[PDB]
Amino acid sequence: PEEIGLLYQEKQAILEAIREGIVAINQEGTITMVNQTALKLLGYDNERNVLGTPILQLIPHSRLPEVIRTGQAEYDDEMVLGGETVIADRIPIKNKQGRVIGAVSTFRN
Amino acid sequence: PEEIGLLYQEKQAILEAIREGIVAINQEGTITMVNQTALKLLGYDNERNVLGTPILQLIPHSRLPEVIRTGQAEYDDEMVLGGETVIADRIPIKNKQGRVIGAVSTFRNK
Ligand SMILES: [Mg+2]
């Protein structure tokens, strides 16, 4: 309850502190985290209609679901997002037991 | 980057570790965080179409937007949701400078 408060505060501080675009998905491919730089890249003003969407709705060429399926990181992937060429790094997220529970893309210009 | 991986892992752990339903919104009333228990109570299988939705489209009687306006915690509100009766405690979430950046409801089984 207060513990959820502090987590939400640290979440927002980390996302805001990262200059690159961040998009995280869960195991089913739903976007669960996104920072302001990624929303700008995708052409959105805020999290409404972006969080809780399948990643392939907003990024049809995303390899984040392949990172979930394989557990394999992918680095230095060029891709086009809204007429801009960006470089994507994609890493799996694991729980304490080593199960892949999501994946993150980092986009830089 | 690695930091986001660790944060995601700690979030998931902490969201499962709470037995109450959790729903969190940002200052615009958009759902930004939810746990398995709140999803089950809402009648959803996953975060899809729950995250990123304005709170009153899923919880019409929610006072979470009231908490954003007033900056003030609200306790002991009885609620029907999954045809289940629950008690909602609602607090504001502040950044390190004490500005309100969101609000969270805890749902306790009556
Ligand atoms: Mg490419």
Numbering used by the authors:
A (entry chain AAA): 200 to 308
B (entry chain BBB): 200 to 309
Original paper wording:
Crystal structures of PASc reveal both anti-parallel and parallel dimer conformations. The N288D mutation in the PASc domain retains the same function as the wild-type (WT) CitA. When the function of the N288D CitA mutant was assessed by a β-galactosidase assay performed in E. coli CitA reporter strains, we found that N288D CitA unlike N304D of DcuS was fully functional, i.e., activated by citrate. The parallel dimer arrangement was previously reported in VicK11 but the anti-parallel arrangement had not been reported. Both the WT PASc and N288D PASc eluted as a dimer from a size exclusion column (SEC) down to a concentration of 1 μM, maintaining the dimer state in solution as hypothesized for membrane bound CitA. In agreement, the parallel or anti-parallel dimer arrangements were found to be the dominant forms in solution, respectively, for the WT or N288D PASc domain based on the following two methods. An inter-N308C distance of 41.3 Å was obtained in the N288D mutant PASc, which agrees with the expected distance in the anti-parallel dimer arrangement. While some populations of dimers at smaller separations in Fig. 2D cannot be excluded, the distribution of large distances about 41.3 Å indicates that the antiparallel arrangement dominates. For the PASc domain in CitA, this CEST effect was observed mainly in the residues from the N-terminal helices that form the dimer interface in both the anti-parallel and parallel arrangements. This indicates a dimer interface rearrangement of the PASc domain in isolation where the PASc domains switch most probably between the parallel and anti-parallel dimer forms, even when CEST does not reveal the identity of the conformations exchanging. Although this dimer exchange seen in the WT PASc is functionally more relevant, its occurrence in the N288D PASc mutant helps to rationalize why this point mutation does not disturb the functionality of the full length CitA.
